Amino acid sequence: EVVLHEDKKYYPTAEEVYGPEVETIVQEEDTQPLTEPIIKPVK
Amino acid sequence: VWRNTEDEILKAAVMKYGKNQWSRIASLLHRKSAKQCKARWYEWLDPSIKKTEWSREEEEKLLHLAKLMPTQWRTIAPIIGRTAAQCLEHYEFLLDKAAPNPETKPARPDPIDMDEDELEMLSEARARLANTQGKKAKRKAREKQLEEARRLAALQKRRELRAAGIEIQKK
């Protein structure tokens, strides 16, 4: 029971700070590349 | 080596400039570099460094540590609250009772006749400490004196000129 500084858990994880039922999304880089219009035009 | 005049300049210099401008201070001193000034401050002249006798608890903790962490005097020293040179000397001394670097040593006192340079430094240190003011701004102050002479000279000469009977207009 020594925690190499490689671990050193600060910072209680999200489920422990928010609750058992609150959902939690973490969204780094996006789907849907930039060329894809948000509002598509008509044809 | 370190001379009481110099480290008494250093106390005042640190008191004035702050604890992070070592090159300024080093410039106050002849024959010192900023590294040596900083070393002397952090080894001897800091007011938070204790030069007292070792309480019995101090000595027991010192030997305790010197066994837990051997030769790591920079690690040990703050754990007990004295500088590593003190801890090292006193630990070897304890071991022998039971058996350079000039920053650490005290300061050779002042002589009866202070060598000329020892004196001019003090005057110039007094010079530097006294003057809070900048250069540009001081030039403006001297110019302000110069300018009142100007207006003052002009007026009397203007008074006298128009008194001589010629009503000059500058424009």
Binding site: - | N4, E8, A12, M15, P109, L122, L129, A141, L152
Partner: protein, 32 residues
Amino acid sequence: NKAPAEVQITAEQLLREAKERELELLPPPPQQ
């Protein structure tokens, strides 16, 4: 002659000398 001086040149003396070197306050703008 190098030989231990009498009193010392402790810092407060320097700070007091510099504070008394008080010439940068200067003379007042002359009343006329």
